[PDB]
Amino acid sequence: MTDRYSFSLTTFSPSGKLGQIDYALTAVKQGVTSLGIKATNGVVIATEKKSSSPLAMSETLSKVSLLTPDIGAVYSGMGPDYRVLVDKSRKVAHTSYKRIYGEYPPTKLLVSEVAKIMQEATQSGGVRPFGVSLLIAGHDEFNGFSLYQVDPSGSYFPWKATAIGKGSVAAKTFLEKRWNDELELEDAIHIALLTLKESVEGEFNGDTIELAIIGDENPDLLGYTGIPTDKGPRFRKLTSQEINDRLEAL
Amino acid sequence: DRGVSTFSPEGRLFQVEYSLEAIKLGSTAIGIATKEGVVLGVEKRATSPLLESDSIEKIVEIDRHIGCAMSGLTADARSMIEHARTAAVTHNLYYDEDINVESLTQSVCDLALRFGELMSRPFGVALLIAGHDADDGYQLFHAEPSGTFYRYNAKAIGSGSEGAQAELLNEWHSSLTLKEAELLVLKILKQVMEEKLDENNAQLSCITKQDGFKIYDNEKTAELIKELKEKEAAE
């Protein structure tokens, strides 16, 4: 046995293209649309719960994932790749930061660590690149609210608002017209629901849409009282009912 | 592509057979074994006149009682010589005696097939290993990159090998003296060399029981060349 694939499977072609990265980006294009919008007092990330079967319980499959109490993530592309990246992202947030500094990492540095993992799958031996693009929304004390995109190459960019996957080109145009620097969080959620309706074909309700926010601290979700400085997670996943309430005022 | 340790349909290792082709391109080396000693001689073959020919080291000492001449990719021989010298001296450490010429040759040949995917390819050099011991007397061996070694009364390797071997077939007999063997190597080297043989582009050496392994001076070889010319002109 032994892993005898100690050589790179991603290499430069004569034109200077890294083929496997381009092909990974193509897989991301086929994926379901997901988006992120940054407000003055929060960030929103959203996507469609494309259920493979109506017998399947789509609640058990979580496309929007908590990485830290103040950082969330959503993707477009290959789901299994995303799931393992979330596991690694959660772990690296502890091993490379929290166990050293005693606090959770700021958004940009956690993004940097995830990016590094995706870059290594692009150069290391006997592996293919991750077939996903991530949108990572988060908050920290010194940088405030932020929204980042991470691609299969490992490159990452900060966004005011953006979209990835199936109908990203149309969705990014829609966001350019609606976005401004004075948006409140509720306005951003409203714009997110409008933008997402364009890319969805079938049912459009709280059960087929997955949406989460980075906003105010939630002391009710902390699980304990007694420490004033601990005020709770800023990440919150909106319920099916909470989404439907905002679809009536749509 | 294909494996490095792959057999051909004829039952030969491709890489070993290809290394033998590299040895055919190498400069000529000749060895002759007699009861008075073993003589080793080589073609230096300098690529340019500015190259200081005395730095060309194709005849090499392994121990006081064992010498070695090479032909082919000579850079590959350095690690083989290093191993041989270590093996010879290590045996002297463990057993307080000289090592048998055959045993030394066997140790060198054990390296040969240690290649795969150990080193990445076979050696591209053949060796003539000459020496003396108390058990089997004066001996001459031909060590190949196949891991095989044959003992020889006389042997030529390199570019003019098959032409030289046919000449050694006729000339060698069991009663040859050392002086006769010296002239015989010079004769055959002069015959297969491209350029005209002199003391600067050819080198002689021998191994005797008394004096051990000796590389000949250019002044000493020059006299043997002059002695050769006169005896050929004598009839």
Binding site: - | Q15, L25, L50, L51, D76, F123
Partner: protein, 240 residues
């Protein structure tokens, strides 16, 4: 680990990777070595395609391995740094274990051995570099000049050149250099080295580098003006 055999024999008995490494040397800038009666001179070409260069900080072509030995090269620049570093480490390791500086022949034999090792080791390619190693042995006044190449063979030279258009400058050296009477002085040795490079270089401005090595660790690099004076004198004698 990556164990792939990259340097292997072909049906005609050639190791193409080693031969293609020589093609990289052929592409490299010209380097020349000439030994006189009491000195050795190393000349090197600098291609003038690169201007706006900072000549203070740009890696020089001639590298000191120890206080008494120097090394110049032709071929891949990045590859040459690895050989030079290894050589420098070995030079100090020799002083440390044997209490003598390396002989020029020993240092050459080490560098050549490294090059050879990379022609039959798994997962590595040969060095695309040929070197000229020059200097004087400790407590000796006999000049030493050696050459190495990717295959790992090495040899001593009265005068030698490597790199692009080395065929031309070698042609010049073969007819101009006399063994019975080599360049008796430093001037004669440098002049012959500059003359040989002027057959190939193009302009004699900042394209020629000269480094003179004398006995007892006396090594110095000539400046632009000093070299320019040689270029002036050569061409003025040529106009006749």
């Amino acid at each position: 680990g990556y164990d792939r055999a990259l340097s292997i024999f072909s049906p005609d008995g050639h190791i193409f990777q080693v031969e293609y490494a020589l093609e990289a040397v052929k592409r490299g800038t010209c380097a020349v070595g000439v030994k006189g009666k009491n000195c050795v001179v190393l000349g090197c070409e600098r291609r003038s395609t690169l201007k706006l260069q900072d000549t203070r900080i740009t890696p020089s072509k001639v590298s000191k391995i120890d206080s008494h030995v120097v090394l110049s090269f032709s071929g891949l620049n990045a590859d040459s740094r690895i050989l030079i570093e290894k050589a420098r480490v070995e030079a100090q390791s020799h002083r440390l274990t044997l209490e003598d500086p390396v002989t020029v022949e020993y240092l050459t034999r080490y560098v050549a051995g490294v090059q050879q090792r990379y022609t039959q080791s798994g997962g590595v390619r040969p060095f695309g570099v040929s070197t000229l190693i020059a200097g004087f042995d400790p407590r000796d006044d006999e000049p030493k000049l050696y050459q190495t190449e990717p295959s790992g063979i090495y040899s001593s030279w009265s005068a030698q050149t490597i790199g692009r258009n080395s065929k031309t400058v070698r042609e010049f050296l073969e007819k101009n250099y006399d063994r019975k009477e080599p360049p008796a002085t430093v001037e004669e040795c440098v002049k012959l080295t500059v003359r040989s490079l002027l057959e190939v270089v193009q302009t004699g401005a900042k394209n020629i580098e000269i480094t003179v090595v004398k006995p007892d660790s006396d090594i110095v690099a000539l400046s632009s003006e000093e070299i320019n004076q040689y270029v002036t004198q050569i061409e003025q004698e040529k106009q006749e």
